[PDB]
Amino acid sequence: IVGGTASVRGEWPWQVTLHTTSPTQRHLCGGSIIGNQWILTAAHCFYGVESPKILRVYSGILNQAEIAEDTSFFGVQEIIIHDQYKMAESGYDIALLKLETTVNYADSQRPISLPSKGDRNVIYTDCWVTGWGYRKLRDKIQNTLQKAKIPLVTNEECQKRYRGHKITHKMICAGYREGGKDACKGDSGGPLSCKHNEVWHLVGITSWGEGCAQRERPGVYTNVVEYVDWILEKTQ
Ligand SMILES: NC(N)=NCCCCCNC(=O)[C@H](Cc1ccccc1)NC(=O)c1ccc2[nH]c(=O)cc(O)c2c1
């Protein structure tokens, strides 16, 4: 996260850090608890991942330093990638991880609500992006989970900023005209969480963009409301 601040422990209890153990253990991508056996994340995170056996999901984490060889984690039983996914920039950048055991919910870890189809007309004014990603284009994974408040931008506005791409209605964009606050490398797969009528909704999944926090280059997110049928289908 560029231009963000350290999170409070437990304030983003749906946020997970997905690790790979190969060749040695490291943070791979963000994701969101959406059900007791289910993490929603980006499809592009699994480029070259051959098997779910190399993955570890850690929940209830604030600091990456909490994670050591003796720290408990959730195994991944299955990776489910949208069958129309080819790459982040063309959409369908969404994936489910089916965990090998179920998450026991607590103040430190619990699921985020998916948006309703009735909320397509909602004007979210309180949206946040979170993660352990870079604080600038050339940087490293951060110890402490970062957060930034970022306003949504209209698709028509977003399309003007990415003339070489097609910004579809299955995408949603967010950014300051002047830049300065954004997701960056290592944040991908994580949530764009919006608070509306005192409830947090998983509005986006961090997907792609040009550089990080550049002026007139908003972040592009998978538009989660357009996938509620797919999520239901794939999780039932
Ligand atoms: N909103 C804006 N402006 N851009 C949107 C930002 C989201 C895309 C950025 N890419 C990303 O976030 C890659 C996506 C990716 C993941 C896995 C494999 C390939 C690509 N992530 C990374 O480049 C990435 C992921 C995990 C990492 N772990 C480490 O220990 C060190 C790293 O340098 C590192 C880098």
Give the chain as a DSSP string.
-BS-EEPPTTSSTTEEEEEE-SSS-EEEEEEEEEETTEEEE-GGGGTT---GGGEEEEES-SBGGG--TTS--EEEEEEEE-TT-S-GGGS---EEEEESS----BTTB-PPBPPPGGGTT-----EEEEES--SSSS----SBPEEEE--EE-HHHHHHH-TTS---TTEEEE--TT---B--TT-TT-EEEEEETTEEEEEEEEEE-SSSS-TT--EEEEEGGGGHHHHHHHH-
What residues contact residue 236 under an 8 Å CB cut-off, 6+ apart?
none
Residue with CA at minimum distance from ligand 1 atom 24: 186
Separation of CA 104 and ligand 1 centre (Å) = 29
93 is catalytic: yes
**Residue 155 phi, psi dihedral angles, 5° rounding:** -60, -35
32 is catalytic: no
Is 215 among the annotated ligand-binding positions? no
Task: Answer whether 122 contacts ligand 1 (Cβ < 6 A).
Answer: no
Task: Answer whether 184 contacts ligand 1 (Cβ < 6 A).
Answer: yes
187 is catalytic: no
Note the CATH number of domain 1-12+112-226: 2.40.10.10
**How far, in Å, CA of 90 to CA of 165, rounded?**
8
Amino acid found at 107? D
Are 1-12+112-226 and 13-111+227-236 equal in CATH topology? yes
**Residue 160 phi, psi dihedral angles, 5° rounding:** -60, -30
Separation of CA 220 and ligand 1 centre (Å) = 14
Task: Answer whether 182 contacts ligand 1 (Cβ < 6 A).
Answer: yes
Is 124 among the annotated ligand-binding positions? no
What residues contact residue 120 under an 8 Å CB cut-off, 6+ apart?
225
Separation of CA 230 and ligand 1 centre (Å) = 25
Note the CATH number of domain 13-111+227-236: 2.40.10.10
Separation of CA 140 and ligand 1 centre (Å) = 10
**How far, in Å, CA of 101 to CA of 56, rounded?**
12
- The domain segmentation of the chain, as residue ranges, is 1-12+112-226, 13-111+227-236
Amino acid found at 110? R
